[PDB]
Subunit: 121 residues, 8 copies
């Protein structure tokens, strides 16, 4: 069982951050979300009723990302994860990756971030 619905590279502009200036200025927020769903039925039938619309999942990711400001990425991801696993019983697991290639971190890197993995129960 390893089928996966993916939303990779979703980049939004959020004012989240533990800093004060961040929650002022904001910055692009990269978010990758893969959902453990089985597309054997979806694949057999070819009907939505057999899977998760990646457009709806997009918007849910969207609601949380540009929603109120948070402090950590853990917040934003734990909120997407529970918005995804509590909206679709079709999604066994929902891992959320959020990168910030624009932090107030003096240096050169392709970005910092976190990446959670939540199943449903």
């Amino acid at each position: 069982m390893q089928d996966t619905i993916f939303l990779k590279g979703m980049r939004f502009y959020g004012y989240h951050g533990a800093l004060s200036a961040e929650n002022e200025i904001g910055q692009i927020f990269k978010v990758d979300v893969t959902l453990k769903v089985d597309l054997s039925e979806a694949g057999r039938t070819d009907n939505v009723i057999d899977t998760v619309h990646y457009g709806e999942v997009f918007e849910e990711v969207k609601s949380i990302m540009e929603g109120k400001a948070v402090n950590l990425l853990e917040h934003l991801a734990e909120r997407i994860a529970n918005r995804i696993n509590s909206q679709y019983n079709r999604v066994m697991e929902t891992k959320v990756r959020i990168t910030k290639e624009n932090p107030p971190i003096p240096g050169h890197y392709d970005g910092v971030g976190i990446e959670i993995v939540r199943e449903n129960k």
Copy 2:
């Protein structure tokens, strides 16, 4: 058995999609096909009859994206997932992935779609 034969970034211009305008104007679909098959024999000998003509697989995956339009991308994955599984029993596992960097969805993101993993029967 952790071996694989892959084909990535296969770009096909299909008129698939749920909406009427999509199949009306069409767009690019980016297929990534990964087949899981023992390569020991093939590498030991060195004759395609021991492996799977990945060039063939293209035409097989390609006869599904330039083929008949449809709704769900999972379909397009299933159609390719099945066609490749069937015509080759040596293929233990089949990974068909299809991306749409350009679906009609207000927003910036690098691409979306679904991924499915199939085994041989």
Copy 3:
């Protein structure tokens, strides 16, 4: 526990390397640090005291690449692997990766180095 906190592409100009000319002219090292840590609490609350200041981690990984030169890249990984492991017990697993796209080696290739995975003790 499949959660993580990452930092990728950290570029540091260190004079490390086995050869004498390397530490003589130096080159770019590309560190990718992935820490495995529960983010549920952090995301549940939303306060760094519940997670790991990844900005801190930079300065920690960075105090190893701009620090004292050495021979083996594995060293540089170990030094960072240890420093981060120690100063944070919340860090279950630590992944330090260091790439050298420019080592003195006749040939075309995009980059090389090693990767090591550490757990907390």
Copy 4:
């Protein structure tokens, strides 16, 4: 146990291929090789005697790649895998990926190929 020595993106010019014109014209051959080695000792000491020189591994990959022409990628990979696992008892597993983004395959794709995984016994 998940430390890994990596050589990613090594691109060579080989005349390998099952075609006749290929074995005539040749084409760039991409090769990724990750070696299951434990860098805990290497990391603790900081001495070569504790790991595999990625330069030697490079050359071995190099010998096979520009060596005599072969037919499949299975050949080239199975030969690198057994050149790596029979030269270093320090390498538990050796997976070899070889991409050919230049095959005689009428279409658009980011390349075709295989990817083997061999342990040592």
Copy 5:
């Protein structure tokens, strides 16, 4: 006077296009506008009033692309042009480049667009 102020890579998702289908689906548009200004005083004095706030420049392009639906990229760039030309006595010329990466044309390409060069009177 080769000094310039630019906004390369501006991406907006509009419903522009001479075909109703594209007027329904919409698509990511990409624009680059490079202003011909004299950054002499701004350079010594360091007073933004001695230059053109590009962020305010981004607005005038955002309002146009994020605005109503239109037919040609030419017009999209037409209002861009004067919109800035009329608002800032600071800029001598407005160079607008508009790209449609995924137009309603069947094929494989970078993108398609136009670039107009308008000064001030």
Copy 6:
């Protein structure tokens, strides 16, 4: 009149080339295009009839590239340049470029290629 209608990176899998082998293998041909079209009232009205529909231009470049094989890129660019020149009085000057990223050449490069610039007569 610096204006233009550009069609970047059109990639066609052609069987052209000076090598009889190449014509059996095939390879992608990346084409750049830049027709100088006075887009004054094209933007004025917003009626494509007052300008060149690149799409048609694309399909015309396509008929060339997917046509039967020739040896030089120069003949290809010319059969293309000729096509446009003899279809759009709108086009003051045509500009074709046909890069070669996979020709039979033992070496490392991003490609080789010719570029021509023809006007109307």
Copy 7:
């Protein structure tokens, strides 16, 4: 004399910007450089003393960018352009560009930035 000594994409983590916040957060500043240097006998002899050592130029651009904060990019490009102009008679003309890929601007773009071109007097 079209010659030049160019220094592309120099990235410095500066605390500059017109926003008091920015100066606390910090951000990368990407700098482009292109000094017009008559490299006639520079290539003739092969004595760098008969030309400009870009390295020095780099470290001189560095002293600027890693210096204390200012508000405009224009002052930065000027403190840089001034530096070169007043150090190398070799340089007939200087050319600075300081892109901004992470400024406080709710929008999607590859960056914004000014570019100046100064000569010697």
Copy 8:
């Protein structure tokens, strides 16, 4: 006569450089040479003799870069220039661009190089 024949992205690993250290380690060099030729007849006739074999052009650059050790990029480009200028009465100008992506300068940048433009007499 804006027609051109080019070799953009030529990568060679030499031991060039004015510092003995770089003369010991070596480094990937990148060169682009765009020839000013008239592809008129080549275009209609399609006879390679009516043009300049770029593959033979790649040779003359390979021999120079893969050749002896030198001091300045200027010279590396100096022999490139005439080497082609003298060998082909077909080309009017040889435009050589040489880049050193990872020079012996401490910092973060794209690359450093020079570009000379020489015609024929």
